[model samples]
Target chain A: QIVYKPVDLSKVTSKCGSLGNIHHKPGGGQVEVKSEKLDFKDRVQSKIGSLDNITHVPGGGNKKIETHKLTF
Target chain B: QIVYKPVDLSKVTSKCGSLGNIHHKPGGGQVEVKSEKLDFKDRVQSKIGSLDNITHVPGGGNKKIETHKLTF
Candidate 1:
């Protein structure tokens, strides 16, 4: 998934927690990361199709979060 | 957006209703359509970022549904 970080990377990471591994998006404006537990492929498919039906949750603390970025 | 259709096209369209103008994918296994009311670009971004917080609703009747397909 691609996440934006224009300031402190820790600020982003702290909210996101341990996202398995991290990488830069070519030019480096965003971070491409993965999650150890969640499966995002199916989630992305259903999500882009139904927007209002979704809920938003920020990653932090003990709650695990995964990458849900899509490129279409 | 892209939507899979293994059976009747009406079965798909009936649930989806009039999703504006309809088109087909290059190979013909799916349909591409748009919604008159929704701004999908932003929705896709948030949805792909967060998945579990989603609700699923099939399109049909007077309830009105829109295309939510995504590609990456």
Candidate 2:
């Protein structure tokens, strides 16, 4: 029950994180705390970041080689 | 397992979208078909687009109020 498609600041679309564990619930899940500052337009090339910045993984929103891609 | 780190061209980061039904397969889910050209840098304050392009929703990777992001 999480859906919203009303942002096209050019292209690249996505936005989620309605709370409720954000989905995943198996031992790791619950990284939904942005307060604004979410972006990732990789249309299936793959790459993240770190430096103690924080990097965990599982499946954002359950999954997609996705992209304008937002998930909260 | 889906986890990678090593990309900080500046700040913001994320990327995921490893297929496997792309996750969610309960009457909806399977929109992971982007070759290239993905760019969304919305720090919260949503938006998307349309015009014969297409749009479906669920979770961009399971969830994150999340960013420089990607999911494939």
Candidate 3:
């Protein structure tokens, strides 16, 4: 178990996901959905978005809103 | 697998827990409990408390002190 704020990206921490089959954003910062477990990702996303529109490897793009890749 | 300092009290992250039972505090944020797996909860509690004593539904205070109900 861990305690975090999710909005203070300045904290310089690492986060991992559990869902499978997520799509990456094509042009910029976005993500597409592919797994039902994405709901769990939303919880963290809400907090992450609250901080800043940071660039992510699996932010999903025009293709789809996938973020399962974050699980790794 | 994750790296956290549990200090600086600025980073925003997400956390979860597992176990059987736990209780929350009222007067300022304390947790009471009735389970043996409390050691696991303590792992996260230590981090949160280090952040700001933000108070959780299971900070493990009063009576026996537990923090599992937060699992869900």
Candidate 4:
């Protein structure tokens, strides 16, 4: 029961994010794609950790205007 | 020259991330970690584009007051 297929974003095109010298628009204008390979083939022995534990992330842009793209 | 040794968060403990019903505090209060295997064994025959693309991402906790963490 592992069916979370959400990649095929039209052949995704972002390329390893990096443009923060006030670039990529603070990364909030968010559009830095590339880094997707959720093969999920039987969860590869049910791996519960690996891929940096990120359930989901789909939000950006505050216009507070002060983003050097920060946080880990 | 592939040495990105940055995943020893004391045995990393985030566990496949997923806590937002206004949970992980918008993911900004960020503390999610786990999913690490940067083997970097001679770049596996110099593969450049397979793990998707993401140069770096380390930022969080906006104190915006409306987290529920978002952004892909």
Candidate 1 per-residue lDDT, tens place, A1-72, comes to 433322212211222212122221222223234222333332233333221324223422232233322354
Q: What is the C-alpha RMSD of each candidate to the true structure, in Å?
A: 30.9, 29.7, 29.8, 29.1
lDDT tens per residue, model 2, B1-72: 333342323222233332111111121222333232435653432222211112233335432232444355
lDDT of 2 by residue, A1-72 (tens): 333343323223333322222121221322333132334644433222201111223324332222344344
Model 3 C-alpha lDDT per residue in residues B1-72, reported as the tens digit of each score: 432332223433332212212222212322243122212222121221111111222321112121222222
Q: Give Cα distance to truth, residue A60, candidate 1, Å.
A: 2.1
Cα deviation at A22, candidate 4, in Å, is: 21
Stretches off by above 4 angstroms in model 2 are: A1-72, B1-51, B61-72
DockQ of 2: 0.05
- Please give the range of 10 consecutive residues that has the lowest summed lDDT in model 2 chain A: A46-55
Q: List ranges where model 1 is wrong by over 4 Å.
A: A1-12, A17-49, A56-72, B1-72
Model 4 residue runs over 4 Å out of place are A1-72, B1-44, B48-51, B64-72
Error of 2 at A53 (Å): 36
Best by lDDT: 2
Please tell me which model should have the higher TM-score, number 3 or number 4: 4
Best model number under TM-score = 4
Please write out the lDDT profile of model 3 over residues A5-68, one tens digit for every residue. Answer: 2232343322222222322222232334222121222213122111111212232111111111
Q: On residues B1-72, what C-alpha lDDT tens digit does candidate 4 reach at each position? A: 222222212211221122222211111222233232333322132222112222223322122221222222
Give the Cα lDDT of each candidate: 0.27, 0.29, 0.24, 0.23
User: Local error of candidate 1 at B32, Å?
Assistant: 15
